[PDB]
Structure formats: structure tokens, C-alpha cells
Amino acid sequence: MQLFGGRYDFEDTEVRRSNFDNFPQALISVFQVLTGEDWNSVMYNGIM
Amino acid sequence: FPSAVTIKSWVDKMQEDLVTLAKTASGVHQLVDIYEKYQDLYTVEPNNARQLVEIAARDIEKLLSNRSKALVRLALEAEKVQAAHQWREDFASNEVVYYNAKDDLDPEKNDSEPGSQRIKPVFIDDANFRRQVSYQHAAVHIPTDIYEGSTIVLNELNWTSALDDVFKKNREEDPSLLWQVFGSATGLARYYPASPWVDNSRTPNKIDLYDVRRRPWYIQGAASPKDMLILVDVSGSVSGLTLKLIRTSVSEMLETLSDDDFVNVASFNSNAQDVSCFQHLVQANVRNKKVLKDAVNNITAKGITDYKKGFSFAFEQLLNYNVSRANCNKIIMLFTDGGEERAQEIFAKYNKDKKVRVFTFSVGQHNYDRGPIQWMACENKGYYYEIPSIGAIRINTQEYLDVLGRPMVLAGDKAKQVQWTNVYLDALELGLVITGTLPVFNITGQFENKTNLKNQLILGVMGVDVSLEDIKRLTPRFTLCPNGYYFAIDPNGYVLLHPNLQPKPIGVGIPTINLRKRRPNVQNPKSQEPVTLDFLDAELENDIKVEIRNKMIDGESGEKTFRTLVKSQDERYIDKGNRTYTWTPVNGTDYSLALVLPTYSFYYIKAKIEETITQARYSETLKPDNFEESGYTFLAPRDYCSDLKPSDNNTEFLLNFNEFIDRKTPNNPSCNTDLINRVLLDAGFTNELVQNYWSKQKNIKGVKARFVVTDGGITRVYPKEAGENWQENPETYEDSFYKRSLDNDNYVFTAPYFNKSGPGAYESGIMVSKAVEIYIQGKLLKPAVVGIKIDVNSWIENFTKDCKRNSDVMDCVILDDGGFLLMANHDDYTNQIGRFFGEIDPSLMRHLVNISVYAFNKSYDYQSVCEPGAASKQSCITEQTQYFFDNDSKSFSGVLDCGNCSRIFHVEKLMNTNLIFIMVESKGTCPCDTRLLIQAEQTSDGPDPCDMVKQPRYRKGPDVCFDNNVLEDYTDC
Ligand SMILES: *[C@@H]1O[C@H](CO)[C@@H](O[C@@H]2O[C@H](CO)[C@@H](O[C@@H]3O[C@H](CO)[C@@H](O)[C@H](O)[C@H]3NC(C)=O)[C@H](O)[C@H]2NC(C)=O)[C@H](O)[C@H]1NC(C)=O
Ligand SMILES: *[C@@H]1O[C@H](CO)[C@@H](O[C@@H]2O[C@H](CO)[C@@H](O[C@@H]3O[C@H](CO)[C@@H](O)[C@H](O)[C@@H]3O)[C@H](O)[C@H]2NC(C)=O)[C@H](O)[C@H]1NC(C)=O
Ligand SMILES: *[C@@H]1O[C@H](CO)[C@@H](O[C@@H]2O[C@H](CO)[C@@H](O[C@@H]3O[C@H](CO)[C@@H](O)[C@H](O)[C@@H]3O)[C@H](O)[C@H]2NC(C)=O)[C@H](O)[C@H]1NC(C)=O
Ligand SMILES: *[C@@H]1O[C@H](CO)[C@@H](O[C@@H]2O[C@H](CO)[C@@H](O)[C@H](O)[C@H]2NC(C)=O)[C@H](O)[C@H]1NC(C)=O
Ligand SMILES: *[C@@H]1O[C@H](CO)[C@@H](O[C@@H]2O[C@H](CO)[C@@H](O)[C@H](O)[C@H]2NC(C)=O)[C@H](O)[C@H]1NC(C)=O
Ligand SMILES: *[C@@H]1O[C@H](CO)[C@@H](O[C@@H]2O[C@H](CO)[C@@H](O)[C@H](O)[C@H]2NC(C)=O)[C@H](O)[C@H]1NC(C)=O
Ligand SMILES: *[C@@H]1O[C@H](CO)[C@@H](O)[C@H](O)[C@H]1NC(C)=O
Ligand SMILES: *[C@@H]1O[C@H](CO)[C@@H](O)[C@H](O)[C@H]1NC(C)=O
Ligand SMILES: *[C@@H]1O[C@H](CO)[C@@H](O)[C@H](O)[C@H]1NC(C)=O
Ligand SMILES: *[C@@H]1O[C@H](CO)[C@@H](O)[C@H](O)[C@H]1NC(C)=O
Ligand SMILES: *[C@@H]1O[C@H](CO)[C@@H](O)[C@H](O)[C@H]1NC(C)=O
Ligand SMILES: *[C@@H]1O[C@H](CO)[C@@H](O)[C@H](O)[C@H]1NC(C)=O
Ligand SMILES: *[C@@H]1O[C@H](CO)[C@@H](O)[C@H](O)[C@H]1NC(C)=O
Ligand SMILES: [Ca+2]
Ligand SMILES: [Ca+2]
């Protein structure tokens, strides 16, 4: 939330559900990264 | 340097040589005599300027009465028929039979859509419609993203199917009536006569974006003018997708505004400011809307939201009254995402009386609270909208007109006033049209006052198209010289009628394209803007013209004679001309009509040839078989009558005219007798001139071609071989040299076009023309203009015989008024004849302009074809420079300098012509050259838009408009 919260403001129409905008969504994203499924997409979103 | 005496002698001898050549070869005196010799085959009739404008205004008003009577009929029938609808939801058993436009015409389509049945029309080809139409029914257009066959659409189709009878009745009552359309509030458009859509949905690669609710006629008929303020949230939270969505939404919302609305775009993030250089409401025309769009596409998101400051800014902007406004619909159109502050105290302080509406938009996908903006919406009599994606923009930025129409509906029959739009290009490729509109009200349970729930909204807008060619048919121009003309203006400055109005769209700024980001198969939108050209932008602007336009805007009638500057048909010369403007108001509407007449065109010629053999011989004079005896003949493609059509090919049109005149007697039971008689008289007089004078001297040294162009549509060029070199328009009224000769009272030299495909330099010659003036009972008339194509080689032999061929000591050139080179002395400049002299010797030209021998002014052409820049052809603005003589002195002697350099010059104006002779020290003596002086169409972007808003042109708004009805419900957001 500190690092990526409110920073996914991309000027495109792509949908990025796995973000860190609030606590439940950040918790879901962290759980998804722990499961290892599509974590690289989250990393790419954080890098961009 | 030679003394002034010898230069004066040389220029004198040259001028008498040229004048004698032109006078003795063209034959002005012989033509004048043969016009005066007969004096009985024709009569001189006055052009009563005061009366003609009155008849034309009455004709225009009565045509608009035609069109208005057909609108009230349709509106009443639509109201009555929809008042008796049942609103069923079972259409499978009872199919709805209609002809859908933009569908394949193949008989094997077999759509068989549930609840609908299609119609296959015959589609005969008919005139007054440049396409194939069917009068057996009406066509229906439905937007591509709107599903046909839904309950709402299918219910509209039957109750609108009763409009076909009234469509047919209106057509049969007035056969010359164009499109009749009903644009529904559900998106449908039912128009008559039936015709396939210009751009079908997806049968080819191209697609159409046509929603009837966004058309200017529908928008003007759906609500009253507005004082709009777009408030944009640029705080930090709107960063990302919602910011681009807001930008697109604001551009689309600006696209819904017309010239009678006033808009300004503000922006707030913990501080409120303006997005552009306007600082107050502006007229919201094409230029101002372009500026606002450019400013909106340039904003960024940063800061903390503060609704109080933004709303305070919006209310202070709406409370200005220091500037021109509409004073009708004060609305704040707030684009945002979501918040937690509703700013009740600001609304209590500024909008206690609820005189200002608020429409709120929540844009994008976000988790922010939407309650406060809904409260803002349906607390201040406004509305609330959600725009989650691009595809939801267009529909959601046009529904605010439904709310604005509630007071108009509640006003009742007082709100059914026929309105007319600006000039715009028809969507069905018909040209420039104006549409008369009339709203249609939903009256269900009106006699009992039962529901009154959806009856506050309109069913749609009825419209009838009127083509500008229909209006031009009520203002004939062939009884006046090619210099006079009609023109009509709005109470807004825009011209409904003008010779300089063209079907091209109005350009704004420099056209910049980026072809590196355009896919080949994306089908970008083309345009939807109207052709709004101001009166002052259609002609050269004086101070007298401004006051004339102001006096004629606010419904006044009068006349004014003065002296003005007139630009030529080719944007190269400017003449000083006597003019008289006579203007009157059209009683039924807000248009004002004026007639422009020069002093010499107060009388015209009416032919009195009545007996047979004279007309027969005058008719056989113009036949190709004896052109060798009477020179190549050109005939103006005028509407002599509807049997023969203009062809744009002069040979075939002349053959058709000749065979039509031979086939039936000139009694003309159903053809314009005046035009034909005038043409025959002109042909006879011109043939007499050619046979009696020109044929006597079969070939003479100096000339290449001798031509005569007369008022009536006869052009004759004596050498047939020179006929192929004749590139002039066969229509006399569209010849630049003809009008230039009419304006001037001397011989006029026309510079050939330089560096263009076609023989125009040596094979043709230099054109010199003079107008024929006659006096019958002391009344001046200018019926014809004669002219000569002087050979370049013989003129060179005249010229050389210090000015010697390829001399390295002197420069000897001849220019015309306008600074175009006709002859030089070095045979090097002679290769470029007709080039602007400021482009080969810019220093001397600049100094000549400085010493006030060549005046110039610049104008803006707002409809120009333009090669797109980098940042095939688009529309933009160009700047045109025109040069002319201002100071009446004859000889100017001086010396130009360049920095430790000096060149002596002497220029002399030739008598009885428009020519100047220049002798100067050679340009190669000292190498001084700063920049080229270009006289050409220069693509531009000015004038500065937010400098014209500080002092704008005079304007009149609509007198009556509807707002703030106490019976309004407004319980919907
Ligand atoms: C510049 O070129 C001109 C043509 O290219 C020359 O113009 C011709 O000059 C002739 C002699 O001056 C004229 O001849 C006489 O002209 C008048 C006309 O009626 C009369 O004096 C005589 O009838 C006639 N002589 C004849 C016919 O033998 C030509 O008429 C005249 N051309 C035209 C069309 O009028 C200029 O001479 C020439 N300039 C110089 C300096 O040579
Ligand atoms: C929309 O569709 C409906 C149904 O197709 C139309 O209603 C139909 O109207 C016709 C003529 O008005 C009716 O025909 C008449 O039927 C009566 C018997 O009911 C008969 O005695 C008459 O001689 C005549 O044939 C038809 O019955 C009626 N259908 C239904 C289901 O009511 C409706 O008119 C259409 N909308 C508009 C605006 O016309
Ligand atoms: C003009 O206004 C009238 C009412 O003032 C509109 O008629 C009303 O239309 C609505 C739907 O738009 C009807 O509601 C529907 O009723 C059916 C039952 O018949 C129901 O099954 C639907 O779910 C829906 O609720 C309403 O009954 C109807 N009222 C009357 C008195 O006809 C009319 O639609 C308006 N005109 C246009 C072009 O919209
Ligand atoms: C334009 O609006 C301004 C408001 O800023 C008006 O200026 C005020 O006018 C009142 C009335 O005379 C004065 O009492 C104030 O002192 C003025 N304020 C300022 C800052 O000048 C102005 O009158 C309006 N009209 C014009 C033509 O400027
Ligand atoms: C309709 O237009 C005509 C223009 O011919 C107006 O007629 C003139 O109106 C003025 C002012 O009312 C009078 O002084 C003239 O005497 C009228 N001329 C004639 C020949 O009648 C007429 O007024 C217009 N209609 C209305 C209702 O104003
Ligand atoms: C068109 O050219 C004329 C030149 O005659 C310009 O008229 C002059 O304008 C200057 C500049 O203001 C004045 O000082 C002169 O007094 C004007 N002369 C006359 C005779 O009126 C005119 O301004 C030009 N038109 C435009 C639109 O610039
Ligand atoms: C207006 O309508 C009437 C009646 O149909 C017709 O006689 C008249 O010619 C129309 N006006 C014009 C300008 O066509
Ligand atoms: C507007 O756009 C121009 C680019 O043409 C840019 O230079 C300018 O900074 C922009 N304005 C703002 C306020 O960012
Ligand atoms: C134009 O007006 C002036 C001034 O009244 C007059 O002298 C002249 O004859 C008129 N016609 C012209 C210049 O053709
Ligand atoms: C105009 O002249 C220049 C050089 O004099 C030449 O390069 C150019 O092609 C010419 N324009 C046309 C249209 O031929
Ligand atoms: C051009 O004309 C202006 C007119 O005020 C004058 O001041 C200036 O000196 C002139 N240019 C030159 C080079 O003399
Ligand atoms: C033309 O110029 C001369 C000298 O420059 C001057 O005396 C004369 O008044 C001018 N004529 C005008 C301005 O009409
Ligand atoms: C004018 O002065 C410059 C600088 O002193 C010099 O280079 C140039 O040659 C001079 N011009 C002539 C014609 O001598
Ligand atoms: Ca995986
Ligand atoms: Ca915010």
C-alpha cells in the first residue's frame, strides 16, 4: 500500500484488478503473489 | 543615371504604342458604335435597388412560410398519433413493417429479424436529390450501437409509421420540397423520401457515427440557448484513466454547443482557475471551441480537491453580466469522480433561488463515494450521469438537453416557434442547407391530466431542409452586372447568402496530422461543424461595412453609397470601386437581405427582338460549322430552361443549345425568353463586330488573339487556334478580367499565371482588356469587355528598340498594379513572366512599398485546402496579400541602399493603363538581399482568438427563451 497505493494511474483502458489501492485489495494481491499465480504481472504493473 | 526627361519620353512613347495597339486592334469604338447604331432592337430598363430587395425578401419569407406550414402539420399529426399509442410488448405476432436504411439492397439478404419486417424499394433516380429516392414510403436510420428490435425502438416504429401520409401530402402540395425528417428522442430518424444511407454500417470497411440527437437542428429545437460553465476536477485522484475520459467527455460536450450558447471551462484543485486565455464566457463558435478543446487536452492531475472554491469560481463567472451572454440557461456542468463534500453553504449563498442548474458527471471506474455529487445534481434542479468508458461518453454528454427542455414543454403552444439553423453540409450529400425545426410534445392523458410523469420530455424534433440553391433561385443576378450581388446575414454576422461562401468546411488554425499513429482500418470521424462564415470575413473589411452590418443585424432597412476596396476573383488584385448597399429585413424571420450594386449597373438591357429572321440569323451566327468565319464561340451555361442542362463541357452544351433553339421556335412557351433574347442580341452584335472589323485585318503583327466577352454569355475569340488557348470560364460573371475591366476606367493588364501546367507565357500572350461604355439617352452602360493577347516577342522588340538585352548596367522592368512582372530586360527574368516582382527582386519591391507607391492589405481565407503538416488535404485558414496603387503621383525617383551600397531607381506610371516602368541600377552591382517578399496563399492560424473576445463583434441573441417553470417536477437525477 505504501509503495504502490495510488500509483496505478495509467492513462490506458487496461484493467488491473490486482493492485494496492486499499487494505483488502492489497491483502488479496499479497495472497495471490504468495500462491505464485500471475505474480509476474503484478511485478510488471509495479515496475510500470 | 539617365535624366528624368529621357525616361519620361521613353515611357510616353511606350504607352502610346501600347494604347494605340490595344485600341486599334480590339475595336472599342466600333463596338460602342454598333451598340449605339441600332438602339431599337433593345430597351434600357432601370434596376430599382429598393424594390428588388423587397421582392427578394418577400420571396424568401414566403418560401420559409411554405416550409413552416409543412412543419406544424407534421408536429400536430405526430402528437395526435403518439397520443393514441398502446405500448405493447408483443411484436412477434404483429410484425412492424418498415424500410431500414443502410442495409444491403440485395434481394437475397432475408434478414427476418424478430418482430420486424423489411421493405425493398424501387429507388428511381430523381432530380433535386443527387441520389436515388423512393416516394412510396419513408426511410428509417437507427444508430449502429442502438439495437433495432428492442421494445423502445419497435414501439416508436409503428406510431411513427403514420407520418408517411403527411410526408406524402407535404410532398404533393409542394413538389420542390426537400428532406422531411423526424428525429426521435430514442435515436431514430424517419425521413422522406426514402433513400439508402450515405455510409452503411459495416458492409464495407467504413462505418458511420450518426446520432440524430447530436445534430445542430435537433439540438437547437430541443432546448433554448445556454450559458454553460464546464467545471473540471484536476485534483490528484482523477489521475489515470478518468482524466483521459474527462478530456474526451469535455470535448464531446463542447461539440454539442452552437453559436447561440456561451461557454467557459474552469478547473479546480484546491484552487480554481481558467483553462485558457478567456477568463469569461465566450460565444462558443468554431474558433473558441477549438481553443477550449486545445486547452482541455493539456491539463494534468495534481493537488487536493476543493469543491467550495471551484463552485464559487463558477458562480462568479456566471454572475458577470459585463460581457455578451445568452442570459437564458445558467448551468454548471461538473466533471469529477467522487468526493465527500457537498458544499451546502456555497449553494445556499450563491444558488438560493435555484436559478442555476447543476449537472454532475462521475467519470471512470473508482471506489470514491458518489452520493455527494448526486445530491449536488438533484438539489440544484440538475441531473446526475455516469461515464465509465469511452463508449458511454457520446450518449451521456447529450442527455442534459432532456432536462433543459422541461420549461419549453411546460410553456405549451407558446414554445412551438419555427427556428432555422446556420448553414451546414447535408449528411445525405445534398450541399449547403438550412433546416427549420419544431419540437414535438408528448401529450398522453392531456385532456385528463393523469400521469404528467414522462410528458415533460419531448418526443423529438421535426425538420425540413432548405437548400441554398433554392434561396439563390429567388435572387436572380443576370439583370445586374457581374459586380453586383445579393447577400443575406443572420442576427449573428454569419452569411446565409454570399458569392464567397463555399461548400468547404470552415478551417481552424494550422492542420497538423500524425500519420505515424493512424491505422489503415480505424474509420476516424470526419466532421460535424457548420459553415459559419462571418460577413466581415467574406469581403474586405472597412469601417463603413462594420456599421452597415450592425445596422442590418438589428432589423433596419436603408441604403448607403460609398467607395470601397474590392478583391478580384483571383486573389491577386484590389480595385477601388463605387458601391451601393441596399438592405432590408425579412419580415417573417431574423435574416436581413442586402443588394450590392455599382454605380454603372443601375440600368440593364432588355432585348426587343420579336420578328423571325433577325432571331434566326442571330441564332445561326453561333454554330461550330462556321466558327472559322466568326471565331471560337463560348456560351455561358445558364438556366435558360429546364429542358437543357448545364454540362461543364462548352462544345456539347453549345450543341444542345443550338439544337434546342432550332427544334422549337424562340416563342419559348416554358423557357426564359429574356435570357435567350439577350443571348441572341449579344451574338448578333458580336458577330457584326467580328465580321465588319476583325475580319478586315486577317492577321496583324503584334497581337495573338482578339476576344470579346459580353454581358449575356457570349465569348468570341477571333483565331480558332487561339480558342484552345482560352482557359477562361465560359460564364461571363465568373471572369476576373471582366470585373476588373468593369471597375477600372482604363486598359487593364492581366499577368499570366507562372510555373503552371499549360501554355500561358508565350503561346498565349499578355492579356489586355477594356470595358465598353455606351450612352443611349445619357445613361451609362457597360455591356461588353474586349481584349487582346499581345505577343511577347513583338513586345520585346518594342522594348529593346541603356535598356538593352542582358545588360549588366541597368535593370528595366514593367509591372502591373499588383507587382507582377510582365517584361524585364535581361531575358533571364523574362523567362519568369507573371511571377511576383518581390520574389525575384525583393529589395526593390520592399523599398517601393516603403515609399508608398505600392499599398497592400492582407485578408484571411477561412475555407482553404491545406497540405497537413508534421507534429491528403484538409481544411484550414490562409493569409492572402494583395498589392495595388495608392498614391496618385506619376514619377518616383530615388536610390535604394543596402549597407555601404546604393542603387538609383526611377519608376513611372504609364498613362491610361495600370502599368509601371522601373529602371534601376543592376542587382549584381552590389550583393544585397535580405528575404523574399512572397505574395501567395500562406497557410496561417490567426487572428488571435482570445484577443477578439475582449472586444467582439456586434450580436443579437434570441428574443424569447424558456427557463425556470414552477410546474417542473425535477425529482429525477
Ligand atoms: C511597337 O510595335 C507595334 C506593333 O507591334 C508598332 O505599331 C505599329 O506601328 C506602325 C508604324 O508606326 C503603324 O502603322 C501605321 O499605323 C497607323 C494606323 O492607322 C497609320 O499611321 C497607318 O495606317 C499605319 N501604316 C501602315 C498600315 O502602313 C501600325 O498601325 C502599328 N500597329 C498597330 C496595331 O497600330 C510600333 O510601331 C512599334 N514601336 C516602334 C517604336 O517601332
Ligand atoms: C402497429 O401495429 C398494430 C398491429 O399490426 C396496428 O394495429 C392494427 O391497425 C389496423 C388498422 O388500424 C387494424 O386493422 C383493422 O382491424 C379491425 C379489427 O380489429 C378490422 O375491423 C378493420 O377492418 C381493420 O382491418 C388491425 O386490426 C390492428 N391490429 C391490432 C393488433 O390491433 C397499429 O395501427 C400499428 N401502429 C400504427 C400507428 O398504425
Ligand atoms: C409519453 O408519455 C407516456 C406516459 O405519459 C408514455 O407511456 C408510458 O410508457 C411506459 C414505458 O415507456 C409504460 O410503462 C410500461 O407499461 C407496461 C404495461 O403496459 C409494463 O409492462 C412496462 O414494464 C412499463 O412499465 C406506461 O404504461 C405508458 N403509459 C401510458 C399511459 O401509456 C410514453 O411512452 C411516452 N412516449 C414515449 C415516446 O416514450
Ligand atoms: C465589470 O465588473 C467589475 C467588477 O470587478 C465592475 O467594477 C466595479 O464596479 C462597481 C460599480 O461602479 C464599483 O463600485 C467597483 O469599485 C468596481 N470594482 C473594480 C475592481 O473596479 C465594473 O463596473 C463592471 N463593468 C465594467 C464596464 O467594467
Ligand atoms: C413587412 O415588410 C414591409 C416591407 O415592404 C413593411 O412595409 C413597410 O413598413 C414600414 C414600417 O412599418 C412602413 O413605414 C412602410 O410604409 C411599409 N411599406 C409598405 C409598402 O407598406 C411592413 O411593415 C412589414 N410588416 C410589418 C408587420 O412590419
Ligand atoms: C487596405 O489598404 C489601404 C491603403 O489605401 C489601407 O488604408 C490605409 O490604412 C492606413 C493604416 O491604418 C491608414 O493610415 C490610411 O489612412 C488608410 N488610407 C486610406 C485611403 O484609407 C487599409 O487599411 C487596408 N485594409 C486593411 C484591412 O488593412
Ligand atoms: C407556398 O405554398 C403555396 C401553396 O402550396 C404555393 O402556392 C406557393 O407557390 C409556395 N411558395 C413558394 C415560394 O413556392
Ligand atoms: C500546453 O501544451 C504545450 C505544448 O504545445 C506545452 O508547451 C504547455 O506547457 C502546455 N500547457 C500547460 C499549462 O501545461
Ligand atoms: C466613384 O466615386 C467618385 C466620387 O464620387 C466619382 O468621382 C467617380 O466618378 C465614381 N466612379 C468611378 C471612380 O468609376
Ligand atoms: C516551379 O519552378 C521551380 C524552379 O523554378 C521548379 O523546381 C518547380 O518544379 C516548379 N513548379 C512546378 C509545379 O512545376
Ligand atoms: C519605411 O517606412 C517607415 C515609415 O514610418 C520609415 O520610418 C522607415 O524609415 C522606412 N524604411 C526605410 C529603410 O527607410
Ligand atoms: C503622393 O506622394 C506625394 C509625395 O510623396 C505627396 O506629395 C502627395 O500628397 C501624395 N498623395 C496622396 C497622399 O494622396
Ligand atoms: C560594407 O562593409 C562591410 C564591413 O565593413 C564589408 O565587409 C563590405 O565589403 C562592405 N561593402 C562593400 C561593397 O565594400
Ligand atoms: Ca501459474
Ligand atoms: Ca479528489
Nearest to B818 by CA among B912, B911, B751: B751
Q: Which three cell numbers stand for residue B447?
A: 385532456
CB contact under 8 A, A8 and B244: no
Q: Dihedral through CA B58, CA B64, CA B69, CA B73, nearest 10?
A: 180
Residues B850, B886: Cα–Cα separation, whole Å: 12
Question: What type of residue is B315?
Answer: F
Query: Which chain A residue lies closest to B244 (C-alpha atoms)?
Result: A11
| Binding site per annotation, positions of B | 233, 235, 237
- Cα distances from B859 to residues B136, B419, B546, B550, in angstroms, run 50, 33, 16, 21
The length of chain A is 48
Q: Across-strand partners of B467? A: B433
Say if the Cβ atoms of B241 and A12 lie within 8 Å: yes
Ligand (nearest to CA of B849):
11
- B367 vs A12, A13, A21: nearest CB: A21
Chain breaks in chain B (C to N over 2.5 A) after: 801, 871
C-alpha B253/C-alpha B831 separation (Å) is 56
CA of B728 to the centre of ligand 3 (A): 65
- Contact at 8 Å (CB) between B199 and B207? yes
Tell me how far apart the alpha carbons of residues B918 and B952 are, in angstroms, rounded to a whole number: 44
Which ligand has the minimum distance to the alpha carbon of residue B279?
Answer: 4
C-alpha cell belonging to residue B142: 437507427
B369 touches chain A (CB under 8 A): no
A10 to chain B: which residues are within 8 Å by CB? 240-241
Q: Which residues on chain A place their C-beta less than 8 Å from a C-beta of chain B? A: 6, 8-13, 15, 21-22
Contact B635, B686 (CB under 8 A): no
User: From ligand 8's centre to the CA of B298, what distance in Å?
Assistant: 6
Atom of ligand 6 nearest to the CA of B856: 2
Largest Cα–Cα separation, chain B:
104
Q: Name which of B491, B532, B535 is nearest B285 in CA terms.
A: B532
Question: What residue type is assigned to position B758 of the chain?
Answer: G
Give the Å distance between the CA of A25 and the centre of ligand 1: 102
* Cα separation, B420 vs B435, whole angstroms: 6
Q: B419-420 and B432-441 as β-strands: parallel, antiparallel, unpaired?
A: antiparallel
**At a CB cut-off of 8 Å and minimum separation 6, what does B760 contact?**
B727, B752, B753, B834
CA B617/CA B638 separation, integer angstroms: 21
- Quickly list DSSP for B796-844: HHHHH----TT-SSEEEEEEETTSBEEE-SSSSGGGS-SSBGGGTSHHH
B239–A9 C-beta distance less than 8 A: yes
Rounded Cα distance between B663 and B653, Å, is: 15
Could you list the residues of A known to form a binding site for Ca(2+), using ranges: 37
Give the whole-angstrom CA distance, residue B53 versus residue A22: 74
Q: What is the resolution of this structure in A?
A: 2.8
* Measured distance CA(B634)–CA(B717) in Å, rounded: 9
DSSP category for residue B506: P
Chain B: nearest CA to A10, how far in angstroms?
A: 5
Torsion of CA B536, B537, B541, B544, to 10 degrees: -10
Q: Give burial (CB, 10 Å; 0-12/13-18/19+) of B303.
A: middle
Going from the Cα of B291 to the center of ligand 8, the distance in angstroms, rounded, reads 13
Distance CA B253, CA B276 (A): 17
Grid coordinates representing B236 are 490528484
Nearest-atom number in ligand 5 for the CA of B58 is 2
**Helix, strand, or coil (residue B182):** strand
- Which H or E element spans position B748? strand B748-750
**Closest approach of chain B CAs to the CA of A44, in angstroms?**
17
The whole-angstrom separation of Cα B127 and Cα B310 is 56
Strand arrangement, sheet containing B383-387: B272-274, B262-268, B227-233, B330-336, B357-363, B383-387
**Do A13 and B301 lie within an 8 Å CB cutoff?**
no
Instruction: Tell me if B406 sits within 8 A of B970, measured CB to CB.
Output: yes
d(CA B396, CA B689): 71
DSSP state of A18: S
Contact B294 CB / ligand 5 (< 6 Å) = no
B241 reaches A (C-beta below 8 A):
yes
B907 within 8 A of B817, measured Cβ to Cβ: no
Concatenated DSSP letters for B261-314? Answer: -EEEEEEESSSEEESSS--S-B---HHHHHHHHHHHTT----S---HHHHHHHH
The ligand whose atoms approach the alpha carbon of B561 most closely is 9
Query: Dihedral sign, CA of B48, B49, B50, B53?
Result: positive
Q: Cβ of B367 under 8 Å from any chain A Cβ?
A: yes
Q: Tell whether ligand 1 has an atom less than 6 A from the beta carbon of residue B24.
A: yes
3-state helix, strand, coil split of chain A in percent (to 5) is 45, 0, 55
Among A13, A19, A23, the residue to mutate for chain B (most B Cβ within 10 A) = A13
Residue in B668, B535, B537, B680 with CA at minimum distance from that of residue B614? B680
Can you state the percent helix, strand and coil of chain B, rounding each to 5?
30, 25, 45
- 3-state DSSP assignment of residue B791: coil
Integer-rounded Cα radius of gyration of chain A: 10
- How many angstroms separate the CA of residue B726 from the nearest CA in chain A? 60
Cβ atoms of B218 and B209 within 8 Å: the answer is no
Question: One-letter amino acid identity for B103?
Answer: D
B266: amino acid identity, one letter: A
Question: In this complex, is the C-beta atom of B298 within 8 Å of any C-beta atom belonging to chain A?
Answer: no
